[PDB]
Symmetry: C10
Subunit: 75 residues, 10 copies
């Protein structure tokens, strides 16, 4: 069992790597929101909900990584 | 049976790394949606369904990673 | 036989890393489609089958990863 | 128990890798804010709250990594 | 020989990683095709064969990875 | 305890990897400052503090990596 | 000798990773050729030889990787 | 003591990976300087000290990697 | 000595990773050559030697990786 | 003495990975030089010395990797 526990711990750590994707992706979405509103202020009310949807969908990939991490850590 | 279990757990953590791809990719699609709508608001109803398609296709690559991850963790 | 079986399962996990390329590449294609249509709506019918071809070819690289992953798993 | 201890230290180091996404992502947000303001100074007040939200959400991904890190260390 | 067979299976999984390069590259080429055609529809017949060549050459890098991978698996 | 000490030293090296994110991020912010000022010199006093904030926030992600690294080394 | 054999198989898989640079690099070259031609069809004959040179030099990096790979396998 | 010493040397190698961030980030800063000057020559004296600040701050992240590498080596 | 030889072989394989940098960098330089000449044909004779210098300098990073690889393989 | 030597050799291969950074970075600088000269040929004598500086600074990060690599291989 020392070997299995050790594996859960290294695996939990590895499972967080993919969070770099959400980190960068979330930022890409908000960068486009900022550049889109700067170029066309009147479009704000239209593109802001799209940025929220995009954030949420990118963020969810990170959710899936963290879920696995916690399953290894505790489950 | 120790060694095999330990391998399943390390392998499961490694399987989540690919999700970073869907995390960046989902964001790339929504950035384009936002930038395209900002430049040409009239195109919104044409490009929004394209963004949905692109996001789902990108997301599915991530699904494949998480599928292998779950096959390892439980299967 | 445990060590070999263990190696199969580590290998199957590693074999999915490459799917990040399709995740990004599929998105790159659709981004080009959206921006190309927004700039020139009249071109939509010409570039749409191009985006479908480009995404399917990109996705295929990731499927070859998954194939090796399943060869290792099963 | 020395093996499990060793594993926690290795895992804690690995758990910091994902913070590179936050370091890059925060910068992407601030780059857009700077370029957006330079192109249209008058939009500053409108886009600044968006940059705060975007950087906060991007940085959160790095906090989750560090949270796993500190769970393993302590 | 549990060591040798284990090495073949882990080696085979590692060998698929580079396929991410084709996944991204193929997409980069098709994105430029799409953006090129949107900007200048009349150039379609000229740039399309160029995109086919580019995709082919980028895809081949992936083929080589898969070849080393299959060598190790069999 | 040769295993535990070995794990601390390998863990510490792995913990510096994420500093690449700050290295790239800091540069992204200063590049936008430079491009922003070149395009609109009059905005310099407005965007400069924004670049300082952005650099600070991106650099902090690196600080955290170095902190885990130093924890493991000592 | 089984350990050294195992190592050659692992090393051969690792040696294919660098081919992702070729897959991306070839695509970058063809993207520029497509966009360059779309913007200025009349330059085609001048830039095409440049794209051949650039892709050949980029692909060479992947051949060196594969060369190391095949040295380890055979 | 061999296993610990071995871990120090593996760790020292791993500790250099992060220097790729400064390699890229320094280049990002100079790229912005060149393009900003080419577009607006008159701004050179304003943006040059910005590029020096930005590069030195980016480089520093890599130096912290090297520091950990030398702590491990010596 | 089995352990040292095995290490030379895995190390030689690892030492090729950095060649992805030359692969991408060379391509970046030639992409700029192509885009620069397309936008301004008259600058060709001026930017072409710069592209060669840039190719050579990027390429040399790859040289250094391969040199280490061959030192491990044979030296 | 086996184990330590083996570690020096694996560590030396790992130390070259960072060179990918200088490989891309050198290329980024020369791409900007080419694009800037193409847009404004008159600026060549001003931006060429900047490219040299940027390339040398980027290259030096790679030098640091190769330095650790050589310290491991021989030192
Ligand atoms: C399922 C995918 C995501 C769902 C998104 C839904 C978006 C719709 C939208 C209206 C959204 O609710 C808004 C934009 C929002 O995020 C609200 C709730 C936040 O309070 C925003 C505005 C906010 O201010 C942020 C900056 C807040 O201050 C900080 C503390 C939160 C950051 C954060 O990342 O929270 C996440 C995120 C919402 C994250 C988002 C999940 O949820 C949390 C909570 C549950 C787990 C732990 C996940 C793990 C995860 C890996 O994805 O993190 C929580 C913990
Ligand atoms: C075939 C692959 C994808 C399918 C896409 C289909 C797209 C069509 C389109 C109409 C889409 O269904 C719409 C826009 C949609 O996403 C719906 C379901 C959402 O509820 C939208 C409206 C929404 O509000 C989202 C953004 C919501 O705010 C937050 C909380 C959802 C986050 C999320 O990550 O959802 C995903 C995603 C849809 C993700 C998308 C899967 O599905 C989920 C649910 C099923 C598993 C658990 C997957 C795991 C996966 C790895 O593949 O994650 C779930 C978990
Ligand atoms: C500097 C090194 C590169 C040489 C480039 C030379 C470029 C000149 C240019 C005129 C080029 O030859 C043209 C574009 C070209 O590739 C011709 C021959 C092809 O017919 C093109 C048009 C073509 O249709 C391709 C897509 C063909 O259909 C498919 C099957 C081949 C793809 C491919 O990537 O091949 C490579 C590549 C040329 C690859 C590129 C190597 O070479 C091949 C063939 C030679 C050996 C066998 C190497 C080693 C090897 C073991 O990886 O692989 C081969 C295998
Ligand atoms: C380096 C040589 C490449 C050749 C390129 C040739 C280009 C010419 C061009 C006219 C081409 O024939 C056209 C566009 C084409 O691909 C045809 C055959 C396809 O049917 C197109 C139209 C198509 O619809 C695709 C998307 C099809 O729907 C799906 C199922 C195929 C996806 C796919 O990735 O195929 C590859 C690819 C052609 C791939 C291309 C290899 O070949 C396949 C089969 C052989 C091995 C197993 C490779 C593995 C590889 C890692 O490189 O996958 C096959 C399996
Ligand atoms: C969603 C999660 C993020 C919260 C963001 C909140 C944003 C709102 C916004 C007004 C923000 O608070 C502003 C810009 C801000 O950061 C203020 C407080 C700072 O004073 C800014 C202006 C500042 O000067 C920075 C550069 C300061 O000088 C330096 C020392 C701090 C940098 C830094 O990155 O701090 C982080 C970050 C805010 C980091 C970001 C977390 O929070 C800190 C502080 C709280 C705990 C301790 C966490 C956990 C932690 C263990 O990594 O780290 C801290 C540690
Ligand atoms: C997250 C908190 C960050 C704080 C940001 C504060 C920004 C405010 C801003 C006005 C700042 O004070 C100015 C621009 C500044 O950096 C001053 C102090 C410098 O002297 C500037 C002008 C300077 O010339 C730099 C390039 C100096 O020449 C060189 C030797 C310093 C490089 C460097 O990277 O310093 C860092 C950084 C400020 C770094 C910044 C941390 O702090 C140092 C010292 C503390 C630890 C060891 C960190 C480790 C880190 C991984 O995060 O490195 C120190 C060592
Ligand atoms: C020191 C750094 C580089 C020096 C560059 C000098 C550039 C000046 C410029 C005039 C240059 O000589 C020209 C552009 C050039 O490359 C000539 C020689 C080539 O013949 C070009 C035009 C050419 O056609 C290429 C596509 C040729 O067809 C193919 C077969 C060669 C590809 C290649 O990568 O060669 C390299 C490269 C020149 C490479 C370049 C080294 O050298 C080689 C030979 C020595 C070792 C084995 C290195 C290893 C390396 C990792 O860098 O590979 C050789 C093997
Ligand atoms: C401080 C770090 C850098 C110093 C840069 C100084 C720049 C000032 C500028 C005047 C520069 O010296 C000029 C442009 C220059 O590069 C000279 C020396 C070259 O001979 C130029 C003109 C040239 O023709 C080059 C492109 C030539 O075609 C090819 C064959 C050289 C390739 C090459 O990689 O050189 C490098 C580089 C200059 C590289 C640059 C080091 O140096 C070399 C030689 C010393 C070791 C072996 C390093 C290892 C390193 C990891 O750092 O590689 C050598 C090996």
């Amino acid at each position: 069992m020392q070997l299995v526990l050790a594996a859960k711990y290294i695996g939990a750590g590895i499972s967080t790597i993919g969070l770099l994707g959400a980190g960068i992706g979330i930022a890409i979405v908000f960068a486009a929101l900022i550049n889109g509103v700067s170029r066309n202020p009147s479009i704000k009310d239209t593109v802001f909900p799209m940025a929220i949807l995009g954030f949420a969908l990118s963020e969810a990939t990170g959710l899936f990584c963290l879920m696995v991490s916690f399953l290894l850590l505790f489950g």
